[PDB]
């Protein structure tokens, strides 16, 4: 019960790290502050400024769905 319930709280806090991340950095981050202009599920910003794979607010969904299935796992 101890070690698992800590694992569950790990799942809740990771999954809210992701969701609260790309829900509060949904609008603009210091990588790209243009994010509010592109809508929700825009793909990327290209390789520019280091590379921008999955910057959108849709990524927080896209990754915390893995953490959802894991945590409910």
């Amino acid at each position: 019960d101890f070690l698992v319930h800590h694992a569950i709280a790990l799942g809740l806090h990771t999954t809210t790290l992701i969701l609260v991340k790309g829900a509060l950095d949904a609008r603009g981050s210091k990588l790209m502050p243009d994010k509010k202009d592109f809508g929700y599920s825009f793909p990327c910003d290209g390789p520019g400024r280091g590379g921008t794979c999955d910057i959108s607010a849709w990524d927080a969904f896209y990754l915390a769905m893995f953490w959802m299935l894991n945590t409910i796992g």
């Binding site: 603009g28 990588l31 400024r49």
Partner: protein, 61 residues
């Protein structure tokens, strides 16, 4: 305003928003962004030296 002055920025989209930096160039030739400022740390493009206007340009003492 002057060259070499340590300047904090007030434009929220710069990488160096609320970080002080040294003024390299001040141009008096009607440029909308005349003040070329470089920094200690570096943004994602590998480029510290950018430029700014006068409203986004706060010196210190």
């Amino acid at each position: 305003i002057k060259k070499g002055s340590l300047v904090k920025i007030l434009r929220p989209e710069s990488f160096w928003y609320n970080e002080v930096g040294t003024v390299v160039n001040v141009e008096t030739s009607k440029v909308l962004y005349p003040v070329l400022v470089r920094f200690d740390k570096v943004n994602y493009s590998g480029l510290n030296s950018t430029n700014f206007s006068l409203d986004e340009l706060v010196e210190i003492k």
